[PDB]
Amino acid sequence: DISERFRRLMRRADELARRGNPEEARKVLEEAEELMERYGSPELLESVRMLLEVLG
Amino acid sequence: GSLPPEKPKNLSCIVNEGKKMRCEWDGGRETHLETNFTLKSEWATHKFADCKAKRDTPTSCTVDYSTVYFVNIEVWVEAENALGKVTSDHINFDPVYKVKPNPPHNLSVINSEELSSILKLTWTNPSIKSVIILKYNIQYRTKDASTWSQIPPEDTASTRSSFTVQDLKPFTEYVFRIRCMKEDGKGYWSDWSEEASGITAA
Numbered sequence A: 001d002i003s004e005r006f007r008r009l010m011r012r013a014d015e016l017a018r019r020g021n022p023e024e025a026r027k028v029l030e031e032a033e034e035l036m037e038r039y040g041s042p043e044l045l046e047s048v049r050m051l052l053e054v055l056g
Numbered sequence B: 001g002s003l004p005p006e007k008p009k010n011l012s013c014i015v016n017e018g019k020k021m022r023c024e025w026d027g028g029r030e031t032h033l034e035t036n037f038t039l040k041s042e043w044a045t046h047k048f049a050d051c052k053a054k055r056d057t058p059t060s061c062t063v064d065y066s067t068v069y070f071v072n073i074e075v076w077v078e079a080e081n082a083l084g085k086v087t088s089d090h091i092n093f094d095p096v097y098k099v100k101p102n103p104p105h106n107l108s109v110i111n112s113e114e115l116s117s118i119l120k121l122t123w124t125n126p127s128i129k130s131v132i133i134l135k136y137n138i139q140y141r142t143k144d145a146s147t148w149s150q151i152p153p154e155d156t157a158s159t160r161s162s163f164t165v166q167d168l169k170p171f172t173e174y175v176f177r178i179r180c181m182k183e184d185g186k187g188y189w190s191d192w193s194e195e196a197s198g199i200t201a202a
């Protein structure tokens, strides 16, 4: 469920960033990034790292 | 006459597997003025890097930022010349639904001349299989056939490395080709793969 868990994280981070909670959105994205580094694809790891850069 | 830019219409975006996100639009009527096009982007409140379309491709822009999946971004085009600045209608989408995969490679017929009525196929899915679940479209025909026959798309509807084509005539040579796309139907079809051949034995 590694894929299933990563999609759940992206859902919370997208909810948080649109609600106006960027600090918690970064917290979720950092958890999702650690998952992609350990057991993930380059395409999804670059996606998370990109989203973090936009957050600033 | 010299006119301000028309509002850009028909804004679509496509993520070709391996390339960055590219978006296209219709610039509208000829303004007879040097017009600059910019593709603005953002996620939540946070803005992406602006994309300025090259002069050779004035209705297309390929962003500089890596493709981002499973979030909802907002895109729109901003056209401007000496006579005014207009923006298109904003679009909101998840780039995961705008993927055009690469066709599967290594298409081969494993058990040529083994069974009379069946031939098994194998291929290698594109790397984008890590993000989306692929649905396929397998076609086959005889060597002398003018039209292609279709494998029912309802069976080739989930990510898979192989397929066993049944109900083939004995000791006849067949050709196959396969394309793939997101199982939702939300995305773009890949091009056709390299053709694979095989014989059915007697």
Ligand SMILES: *[C@@H]1O[C@H](CO)[C@@H](O)[C@H](O)[C@H]1NC(C)=O
Residues within 6 Å of the ligand: B035, B036, B080, B081, B082
């Ligand atoms: C359009 O872009 C060019 C870039 O060379 C710039 O020199 C020009 O001032 C721009 N014009 C407008 C109206 O933005």
Ligand SMILES: *[C@@H]1O[C@H](CO)[C@@H](O)[C@H](O)[C@H]1NC(C)=O
Residues within 6 Å of the ligand: B105, B106
């Ligand atoms: C499959 O395709 C790759 C890349 O085109 C090629 O290097 C390889 O030899 C092909 N065959 C197998 C069995 O991998």
